Write a protein that binds this ligand. Structure first.
Ligand SMILES: *[C@@H]1O[C@H](CO)[C@@H](O[C@@H]2O[C@H](CO)[C@@H](O)[C@H](O)[C@H]2NC(C)=O)[C@H](O)[C@H]1NC(C)=O
Ligand SMILES: *[C@@H]1O[C@H](CO)[C@@H](O[C@@H]2O[C@H](CO)[C@@H](O)[C@H](O)[C@H]2NC(C)=O)[C@H](O)[C@H]1NC(C)=O
Ligand SMILES: *[C@@H]1O[C@H](CO)[C@@H](O[C@@H]2O[C@H](CO)[C@@H](O)[C@H](O)[C@H]2NC(C)=O)[C@H](O)[C@H]1NC(C)=O
Ligand SMILES: *[C@@H]1O[C@H](CO)[C@@H](O)[C@H](O)[C@H]1NC(C)=O
Ligand SMILES: *[C@@H]1O[C@H](CO)[C@@H](O)[C@H](O)[C@H]1NC(C)=O
Ligand SMILES: *[C@@H]1O[C@H](CO)[C@@H](O)[C@H](O)[C@H]1NC(C)=O
Ligand SMILES: *[C@@H]1O[C@H](CO)[C@@H](O)[C@H](O)[C@H]1NC(C)=O
Lengths: 49, 195, 291
């Protein structure tokens, strides 16, 4: 096996799909959202490499 | 008398369409290869749910009574099909010791063979599922598989712990079992597994 | 937000972006409109039976109609100009359309005009005490309209009665229909009228020429009930038109979502309402009004 599926996930949309109250609460958790996107992006670039 | 509940007592647990998929669901089903009581009209408990079946040539069985006392003291369900019309009422009816048919009502509704029914009473809703099939057997329940589609959902909120029949048939008792159901292309349940 | 390079700069928290491709934002189509679909309104509650009743009950023997397992169209009532009093406590009529209840009780009776005020929480008097008592925490509606045209006649209509004596005040929604001779004194009456022995009821004098205060008024009191049972009395919950091939915010009988609704080629069973994906995701519905 050489590569995987280059999946990416929008944490916001995954957790608080199209909800404003939910999103405003989510903002309190800080960078969790960003770091998950970043990690998966890492994975996807590795797959191409 | 007792007989084998081979693979009978499967009903669509919800109103959802699913095709070409195996779905696992926990609900009150009739356990596979269980004992079903066989009758040729006493009062029977309603532990959590009932699987009723009737083999008919001349439509002898007509109705059901449900409740706790069933003696003009409290609310009780009466369900009756008379030749052309179905009747459902929830009056505190004064029943006979041996009610039959010859040859404070808080709700009222009016509308060779095997007829299979499932009655269950959940969150005050009385759910009734059923299925009609042609058969060629005089002894017992045919072995095979068929699913029961819901017919009625009555918002009664009435406590039931006992019931009786109004006119041979079989009774089984449902239990909280996990099932795996095989929905085909057409969203019909074609096979099941008792987990 | 000036330009995409600026979005990039803000994302990286830098003024100097090195060559590359950067994921900055997330494109998402916004829904243009809201679709609400519910089944055709059916099995209306028999409000006619109560309001359009030919004859009403006396206040001491007020009728109680139970309303259950139907759709209650309150609009026809609070938008009607036929009512002089439409008072609602701890509830707004308009809001009723969005609410379900286990049971609704329409208490119908007739009183004189000046006594209409007694049909309210924390009232006192002959009516509030001996005929019909509302609780202090009553959460229903009181509807009253003049019935001089119907419940008055030349010479005086005395068919409508009221209780004039009672050994104690009534409890909320208590009904006393007894005709026992009231013992005003220490001497037992033994069902015989006389000194300190009076009949507990008396007639209303309803003539067409009577003062508005003394003219007959028909009263319906709606009480709302939430039991340990299903709520079977619901409001109309009005629908909208259906839009296809657009990003919309849809609401079908129970379920909400956002998507593009398209003609499907799926073959639901006659009972199946909404379809599902492998991932327990709603993928298809049945329009409640059109199958
Ligand atoms: C089955 O019994 C029911 C009542 O138990 C019958 O329904 C009544 O029919 C008459 C005539 O149409 C109506 O006036 C009544 O209002 C009906 N009853 C109810 C509760 O609505 C019915 O007629 C019987 N079936 C047949 C085929 O005769
Ligand atoms: C789903 O039901 C439909 C209708 O009964 C079946 O479709 C028919 O299949 C036969 C045999 O291939 C064809 O001769 C017909 O032309 C089809 N009719 C239509 C309207 O498509 C289908 O076979 C069923 N599928 C399953 C899995 O049971
Ligand atoms: C809900 O009500 C609507 C409106 O009365 C019904 O729509 C009709 O449907 C028939 C059959 O498809 C059409 O021939 C008519 O043109 C429709 N009428 C109108 C005014 O557009 C609909 O059938 C009802 N559905 C249910 C489930 O009760
Ligand atoms: C189940 O049925 C079998 C066969 O009739 C019988 O031997 C057994 O006693 C039954 N089980 C119970 C618990 O009665
Ligand atoms: C009728 O049923 C209702 C259910 O709330 C009950 O309160 C009432 O006591 C019953 N009436 C009679 C006369 O039994
Ligand atoms: C149903 O029975 C249970 C157990 O006896 C009891 O707790 C409950 O009050 C009953 N329901 C009604 C509506 O009386
Ligand atoms: C009573 O009937 C009249 C028509 O005769 C109608 O205007 C009114 O809406 C009816 N009452 C109710 C409560 O619907």
């Amino acid at each position: 096996p050489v590569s995987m599926t280059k999946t990416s996930v929008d944490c916001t949309m995954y957790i608080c799909g199209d909800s404003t109250e939910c999103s405003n609460l989510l903002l309190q958790y800080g960078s969790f959202c960003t770091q998950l996107n970043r990690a998966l992006t890492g994975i996807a670039v590795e797959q191409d490499k | 008398a007792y007989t084998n509940s081979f693979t009978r007592g499967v009903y669509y647990p919800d109103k959802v369409f699913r095709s070409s998929v195996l779905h696992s669901t926990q609900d009150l089903f009739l356990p596979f290869f269980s004992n079903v009581t066989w009758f040729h009209n006493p009062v029977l408990p309603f532990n959590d749910g009932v699987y009723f079946a009737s083999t008919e040539k001349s439509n002898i069985i007509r109705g059901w009574i449900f409740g706790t006392t069933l003696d003009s003291k409290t609310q009780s369900l009466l369900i009756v099909n008379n030749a052309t019309n179905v009747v459902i009422k929830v009056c505190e009816f004064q029943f006979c010791n041996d009610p039959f048919l010859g040859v404070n009502c808080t709700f009222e509704y009016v509308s060779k063979n095997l007829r299979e029914f499932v009655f269950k009473n959940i969150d005050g809703y009385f759910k009734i599922y059923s299925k009609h099939t042609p058969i060629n057997l005089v002894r017992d329940l045919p072995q095979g598989f068929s699913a029961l589609e819901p017919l009625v959902d009555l918002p009664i909120g009435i406590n039931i712990t006992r019931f009786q029949t109004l006119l041979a048939y079989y009774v089984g008792y449902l239990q909280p079992r996990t099932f795996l159901l095989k929905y085909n292309e057409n969203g019909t349940i074609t096979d099941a597994v008792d987990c | 937000a000036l330009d995409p390079l600026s979005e990039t700069k803000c994302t990286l928290k830098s003024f100097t972006v090195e060559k590359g491709i950067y994921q900055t934002s997330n494109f998402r189509v916004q829904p243009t409109e809201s679709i609400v679909r519910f089944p055709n309104i059916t099995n209306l509650c028999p409000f006619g039976e109560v309001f359009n009743a030919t004859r009403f009950a006396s206040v001491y023997a007020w009728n109680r109609k139970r309303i259950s397992n139907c759709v209650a169209d309150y609009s026809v009532l609070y938008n009607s100009a036929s009512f002089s009093t439409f008072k609602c406590y701890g509830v707004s009529p308009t809001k009723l359309n969005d609410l379900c209840f286990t049971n609704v009780y329409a208490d119908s009776f007739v009183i004189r005009g000046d006594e209409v005020r007694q049909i309210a929480p924390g009232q006192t008097g002959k009516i509030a005490d001996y005929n019909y008592k509302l609780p202090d925490d009553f959460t229903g509606c009181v509807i009253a309209w003049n019935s001089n045209n119907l419940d008055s006649k030349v010479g005086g209509n005395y068919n409508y009665l009221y209780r004039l004596f009672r050994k104690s005040n009534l409890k909320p929604f208590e009904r006393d229909i007894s005709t026992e001779i009231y013992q005003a004194g220490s001497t037992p009456c033994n069902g015989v009228e006389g000194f300190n022995c009076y009949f507990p009821l008396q007639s209303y004098g309803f003539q067409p020429t009577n003062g508005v205060g003394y003219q007959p008024y028909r009263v319906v009191v709606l009480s709302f009930e939430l039991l340990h049972a299903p709520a079977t009395v619901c409001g109309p919950k009005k629908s909208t038109n259906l839009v296809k091939n657009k990003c919309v915010n849809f609401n079908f009988n129970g379920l909400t979502g956002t998507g593009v609704l398209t003609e499907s080629n799926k073959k639901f069973l006659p009972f199946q309402q909404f379809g599902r994906d492998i991932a327990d995701t709603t993928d298809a519905v049945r329009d409640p009004q059109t199958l």
